[PDB]
Amino acid sequence: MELTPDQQTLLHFIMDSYNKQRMPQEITNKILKEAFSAEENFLILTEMATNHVQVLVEFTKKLPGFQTLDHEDQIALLKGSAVEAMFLRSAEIFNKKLPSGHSDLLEARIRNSGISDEYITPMFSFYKSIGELKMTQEEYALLTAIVILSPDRQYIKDREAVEKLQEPLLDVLQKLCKIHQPENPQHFACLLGRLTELRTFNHHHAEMLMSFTPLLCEIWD
Amino acid sequence: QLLRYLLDK
């Protein structure tokens, strides 16, 4: 069926936060003008990943009911979703927001930034599988909100309070898949199936760190 | 620290 006026208010409020968030021009111009080397390619990724942490906190702050949660759970939800939310945002940027040369130049930069092949190949297989879904900005905004408000995270004291905030967002997303994709009735299960693929990046990222920026060090280690 | 600042501002 169709979204209720209550769900429309909830979607508009999420989009108000998500749509304002953009990659700065100084970083975008750096992808095309900076020198190509393993050290410089790694530096651009640090600047990008740092910017995402400020973007994540700003989006999470506006999520209805997040500010009413226990302070320790607020930190655990941010730390637990930092990696997943970044790759989901990376998938959106790598499959959409690119003029003519940025797409291929950034791929070359990621591949030649000193990150091992065992971590590189799953990234691009995830970007390609997500790109086949042909998701809209609404679906990206909701999936990010669902990734952040995950009650299954480690060291969460009040998991039920997280479940209460997540459930309205899964319901809006379920209704969106039925409306914009009625010919593919299994589209919703496919979106959630890509989340188990997103979760495998957590162990890959931890391994990559054992082999920055004050903000990145706090959210990671 | 930096997370709490960004969270509470």
Ligand SMILES: CCOC(=O)c1ccc(NC(=O)c2c3c(nn2-c2ccccc2)CCN(S(=O)(=O)c2cccs2)C3)cc1
């Ligand atoms: C709408 C605005 O959104 C944002 O603010 C935003 C979105 C995405 C990103 N993405 C990235 O920083 C990023 C990384 C990688 N790829 N990749 C990427 C960027 C664009 C497109 C596709 C992929 C691999 C290495 N990691 S890392 O955390 O391991 C790392 C960190 C340092 C050294 S290595 C980071 C940044 C900001």
